Amino acid sequence: GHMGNAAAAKKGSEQESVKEFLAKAKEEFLKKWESPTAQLDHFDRIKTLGTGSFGRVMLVKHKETGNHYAMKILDKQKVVKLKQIEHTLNEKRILQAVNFPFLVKLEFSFKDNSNLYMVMEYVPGGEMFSHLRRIGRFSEPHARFYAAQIVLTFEYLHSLDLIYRDLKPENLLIDQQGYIQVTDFGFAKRVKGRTWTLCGTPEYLAPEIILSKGYNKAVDWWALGVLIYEMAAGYPPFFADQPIQIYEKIVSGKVRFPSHFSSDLKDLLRNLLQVDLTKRFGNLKNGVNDIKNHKWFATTDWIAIYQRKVEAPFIPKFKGPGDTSNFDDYEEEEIRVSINEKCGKEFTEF
Template sequence: MMSSWKQKLKDFSGARNKSPVANHKDDSQSIASSHSNHLQAENHEVPLSSSRSSFESSNLSNDKTPSLLSTPQFSTSSSDGFTKEEGGGKFEEKSQVNKEEDEEDDPARRPTITPDITSNFSNLQLSSEDIDSNKEPKKLFHPGLLTVKIYHGSDFKVPFDINHDRNLLVKLINTSSDPQTREALTRRINQLSSIDTNSEQFLTKNNRNVINKYDIGSLIPANVTIPPSIIKNSLIYFSLEFDKTIVTLDADAGSIYQPIFNKISQFDVTKVNNELKFQVYLRLPTILTSISIDEIDTNQDVLISSKTISLDFSNINNPVRIKNHDILKFENDYLGFNHSINGELTLTIDFKPNRNKQLNINDFDLLKVIGKGSFGKVMQVRKKDSGKIYALKAIRKAHIVSRSEVVHTLAERTVLAKVDNPFIVPLKFSFQSPEKLYLVLSFINGGELFYHLQREGKFELQRSRLYAAELLSALECLHSLDVIYRDLKPENILLDYKGHIALCDFGLCKLNMKNEEKTKTFCGTPEYLAPELLLGNGYTKTVDWWTLGVLLYEMLTGLPPYYDENVTNMYQKILKDPLRFPNGFDADAKDILIYLLARDPKIRLGNNGAYEIKQHAFFKGIDWRRLNNKGYQPPFKPKVKDGFDTSNFDREFTNEQPVDSVINDYLSESVQKQFGGWTYVGTENLGDSLSKN
């Protein structure tokens, strides 16, 4: 029997070179005398605004070449044998109705300061500039279901050398999960064994034969079962992403060169324009690879091909077939391989609009509780018609009314409906009942960044750099929409199953903030509050760059720069203490932090826009288009089995029975009117949605 399999391989595109030290320095920098804080290191002072005033009162709440010989052909019937992904799973948890709902804060999370304000819509009204009468008429759009049928692939090549001998390959072929595949590949390898090993088709290396790397895929089964286990392991699979919803489609038969899928996947369409992104991954056993063991990361699969299709769903009133057994050719953009095309896929795509569909809680199966807060709970749910997994946030209206949080709750819904960024959790739907508000979001199950940071203590430089770059993209998107985030921290950042950032929790966002416009609302998380916010003189979008600096510092060192258990002392440190770095701290990281954490917002990096930060040496080598296409493989990939996996959530929540409890809150008609326009299925103009009653 073969040795144990290594589950995953690292990305071969190569790590970026270390960035050179930035050329720009500010005269206001100085080296302070060394003294102990939570770090003993070099000290740097940053400018402090001279003005000072008291701040407003506040309340606290805790809240992804042809073969050398003829390639064996496999059955690729497109009419039978389809498997609907995610459709066959069984769930023990049943939706129930309870009389009470236990809503509580999570004590492990850092408290967030929220402003004490009266519920009104002043923070939500879009300016007249947002609705331009000279713009082209709005396209007619109906939300609906997108159905993708994946039949089979061909010409997928292994882009790196594979070491093997005949006996090893025979053993591998015999583990194929499909009898027809075993028979075809056995014939294939018997043909190869009759060839002179001194021919051009073979090379010799360490007494092992190395077949042309583009041909080896025709000898490796696409799906294997390693005894004594009966579990099937796909050695080639697709990642299919639509509107931040990601599914994986495993090959059922064939070879890596010619995989057979016969799978169906459905997606909810809630935007008129969107993209369908395909990525092809290899998952090969270590014994076949010529890569050094030291170079293998067991948390990584090998991305070998990708392709993105742009889709326009405007003016579609009836079911339509967008692609009919079309051949999709894959590309290797950003992957670092020599050949530009790697494989093709046969598929069909259909779209069926759902006209006048009104959602309610009965359209979802409640699967797991994944979080709870002071206003309600978050549950993992499955939409019954599409079978897609989402996160559903249920909020009691009475609670947010009594705590004057209507504006912030509506702001969260507004921002989520408006943004379109790869690193922000998107809103899929929102609806309401007389007692509750519901937000349906993409289910991101890689866990909170806070959880991973607490477990590991701190992150390595490359990992922190990628996270910071993705967050920079997210914040830049919000600022382009005149939105300040105001509460950046590890607790509000999720990782998707590939390890990319997903920014969530938009309850403290401030809308309609033009470039130089200021607000004085005192809110945020104590460790992350900017000096100008503490001084109470008002702040602009630049406050978000301070929090980005604090987060980057915390990722690299394990603690925020001015952390103190006493909040009052911590505020004084934020205003006055020098910025300290541990010995051996990366020069570029130090430089960007000095400028992101400049106490004077006018000289803070990013004051003139996000491009200032992008141009810093710390981010040298980053292709921002590639970044926004999720073209970089994250250094860390969370342990996630599938789209249902909740292992990265607190068991205290996931062990709880998922219920949408019955409550008897009575709200007057005038109070209910405050929630007019809450419902969202992707059809209305954002401004219209806020003005409805």
């Protein structure tokens, strides 16, 4: 076969150990999930780090401790549509319950008359997105190092019946050791089987989402294919100026690859970017192991990635606490808190 006796035995033992880890991880998650901490004037607001549908993420400094954090601010009155509301409650509840080396750590959450707030560990190395756009494309070893972290993170999340649903370089922060921290759980959801919301980012949507079919955690494995392609090419596989054109390319079942992609990479990507769910890697009887045991990952020491023992492709420059040099600049808008409580009943559980 492809493996000798000793290699095969090592892999099987490795798989029993994964099972053991995931069983303990589920016990720990469920305790926090069933039983889900600060105030706005406890922080100085420093700089906007990014902006989105409902608000912004700011660097903030905790006044008493001096620790820096990323604060996501959501304007309750912008969170108006039904699935925008439910998604915000998903995000907070999931973030407070998970624990994994490549997932950002939530430290505080609170609300006031106008806004919802989630305060997370600050990751100063910047978004994968801007490093990727600046350099053009990552080498295959570099892309593989980041991809391995996403594979392990999705194996963790999926074992908890969590779907992530917004993988993209914008959502992947690089920490001081050069490893990934996934942020933004605004589209994540606990799903036992299928779910039906039409949501995500156009370039990263699986065909079954676009086609209004009930879908499952395999949409994350499709998105991994898009991510790996974009990291290694510098642009995603379904690339057009308008969402409707992107959707048409996704559904077609066609993908073209740069001539510099290795054949191992193309093989992996054809099996992730697979429109037929009975054939998509991650979704078959051997689950995530079809991905982890693929030839493109043959040099990957999965346990060593998890333990953060592997040397990273690069280490972001950092000048000290609160350095924002690895982030782009955004227009600053003052945080106004109304004297009247807004949308109190829609956000009771937050």
